[PDB]
Write an enzyme that holds these catalytic residues in place. Structure first.
Site, mmCIF file in Angstrom:
data_model
loop_
_atom_site.group_PDB
_atom_site.id
_atom_site.type_symbol
_atom_site.label_atom_id
_atom_site.label_comp_id
_atom_site.label_asym_id
_atom_site.label_seq_id
_atom_site.Cartn_x
_atom_site.Cartn_y
_atom_site.Cartn_z
ATOM 1 N N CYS A 1 42.829 43.307 44.566
ATOM 2 C CA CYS A 1 43.055 43.446 43.143
ATOM 3 C C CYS A 1 44.256 44.365 42.937
ATOM 4 C CB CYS A 1 41.844 44.059 42.470
ATOM 5 S SG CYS A 1 40.279 43.148 42.642
ATOM 6 N N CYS B 1 38.516 47.471 44.824
ATOM 7 C CA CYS B 1 39.076 46.249 45.385
ATOM 8 C C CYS B 1 40.574 46.407 45.716
ATOM 9 C CB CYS B 1 38.808 45.106 44.389
ATOM 10 S SG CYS B 1 39.754 43.538 44.548
#
Length: 107
Positions: A34, A31
């Site tokens: 993230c 991700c």
């Protein structure tokens, strides 16, 4: 390093049983967003010393905690006040935005 590094055996202790504000970050290594917020969580943990703790759970390494809070999409930021989920933010944000979230939900 102010950031608690959670697991699924330590989740109940580190978060559910904390006396105060815990900002859980559900994330994963693939991700990008993230990863984009990670330098920011550092700044926050510093600036919010004594007002909250920042913690992080990696959902691939720790795959059994996130469906408990119905997480479907990362990064998800839950604010817990004494083991109760006061506030949810899904996806990424900037520092200013994260401040706002916190100040507004810490009060």
């Amino acid at each position: 390093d102010k950031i608690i590094h959670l697991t699924e055996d330590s989740f109940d202790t580190d978060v559910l049983k904390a006396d105060g504000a815990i900002l859980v970050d559900f994330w994963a290594e693939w991700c990008g967003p993230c990863k984009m917020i990670a330098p920011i969580l550092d700044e926050i943990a510093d600036e919010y010393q004594g007002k909250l703790t920042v913690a992080k759970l990696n959902i691939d390494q720790n795959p059994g905690t996130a469906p408990k809070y119905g997480i479907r999409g990362i990064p998800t930021l839950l604010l817990f006040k004494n083991g109760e989920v006061a506030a949810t933010k899904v996806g990424a944000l900037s520092k200013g935005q994260l401040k706002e979230f916190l100040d507004a939900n810490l009060a």
